[PDB]
Amino acid sequence: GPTGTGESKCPLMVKVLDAVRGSPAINVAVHVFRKAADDTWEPFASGKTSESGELHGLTTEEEFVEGIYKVEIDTKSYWKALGISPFHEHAEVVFTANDSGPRRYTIAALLSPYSYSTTAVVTNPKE
Amino acid sequence: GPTGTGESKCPLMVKVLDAVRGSPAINVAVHVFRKAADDTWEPFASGKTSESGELHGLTTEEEFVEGIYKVEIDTKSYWKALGISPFHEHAEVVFTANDSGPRRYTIAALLSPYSYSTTAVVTNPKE
Numbered sequence: 218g219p220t221g222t223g224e225s226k227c228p229l230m231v232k233v234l235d236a237v238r239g240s241p242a243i244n245v246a247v248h249v250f251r252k253a254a255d256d257t258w259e260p261f262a263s264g265k266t267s268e269s270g271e272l273h274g275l276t277t278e279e280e281f282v283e284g285i286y287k288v289e290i291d292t293k294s295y296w297k298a299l300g301i302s303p304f305h306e307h308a309e310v311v312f313t314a315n316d317s318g319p320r321r322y323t324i325a326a327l328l329s330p331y332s333y334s335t336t337a338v339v340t341n342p343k344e
Numbered sequence: 345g346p347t348g349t350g351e352s353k354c355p356l357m358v359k360v361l362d363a364v365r366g367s368p369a370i371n372v373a374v375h376v377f378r379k380a381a382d383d384t385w386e387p388f389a390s391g392k393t394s395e396s397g398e399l400h401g402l403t404t405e406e407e408f409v410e411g412i413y414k415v416e417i418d419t420k421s422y423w424k425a426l427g428i429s430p431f432h433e434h435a436e437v438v439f440t441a442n443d444s445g446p447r448r449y450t451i452a453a454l455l456s457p458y459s460y461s462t463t464a465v466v467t468n469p470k471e
């Protein structure tokens with residue numbers, strides 16, 4: 218498993234779906250941050266979802282150390298570009314990772330203009 | 345039940361449900377904040393949900409002016425009290441409050457240990 222800003226066995230993956238059109242939510246910007254020593258959020262990784270609504274390759278197993286991470290989904294620009302003025306500014310998922318060892322995390326979000334749902338699927342690696 | 349920063353017509357209400365037990369999520373801490381010129385968040389109101397899982401009297405119409413607000417729900421303390429290991433650190437809902445539109449805002453949240461869903465009901469009448 219590789220080291221730095223690429224994809225190991227992809228420890229963090231984000232998947233976003235659209236509940237109004239019944240399709241993946243394409244081109245949604247995603248920003249990830251790690252809480253720093255000094256209690257503030259430092260930028261950790263970023264990207265855009267693909268044609269299938271997924272974003273892989275945000276980090277490696279070597280760079281994804283234990284910590285508190287924040288994944289911010291720009292849902293507002295997403296809906297605005299489809300001409301809807303949605304309710305939320307963005308959708309955020311904050312969680313503690315790899316505190317009992319490394320794990321793979323998939324963060325999924327289902328979006329509607331006035332509602333969002335999020336779920337996480339966590340698997341214990343090995344290959 | 346409870347309250348916050350003083351009781352009026354109830355321009356903002358929060359309701360929290362438990363998907364694991366099919367009940368209202370009681371005694372959950374809720375904090376609300378208003379975004380400031382310097383872009384940081386300032387405390388605005390807070391409280392704990394009552395027996396029916398609702399939190400009212402957080403603000404009043406004079407004080408609730410346009411801006412961007414953040415509602416933070418301490419979901420982690422809620423699952424720990426139940427003996428469940430939860431995934432999220434808390435649930436946040438960030439939205440812009442506008443005059444133009446409707447006035448009553450109900451933010452509802454349905455919690456599971458690895459997943460949460462949030463919806464907003466914005467009306468002209470009550471609740």
Ligand SMILES: CC1=C(/C=C/C(C)=C/C=C\C(C)=C/C(=O)O)C(C)(C)CCC1
Pocket residue numbers: 234241269270324325326327334335336337
């Ligand atoms: C049910 C559900 C969710 C998970 C969806 C997943 C895990 C979808 C995987 C593949 C799909 C839906 C088909 C596809 O890409 O073609 C999320 C967390 C969004 C929250 C709302 C309820």
Ligand SMILES: CC1=C(/C=C/C(C)=C/C=C\C(C)=C/C(=O)O)C(C)(C)CCC1
Pocket residue numbers: 359361450452453454461462463465471
């Ligand atoms: C969040 C949530 C849910 C609960 C909603 C509740 C308890 C709403 C109460 C009042 C509302 C939404 C405003 C209105 O008075 O019209 C259900 C179980 C549907 C599942 C999806 C997630």
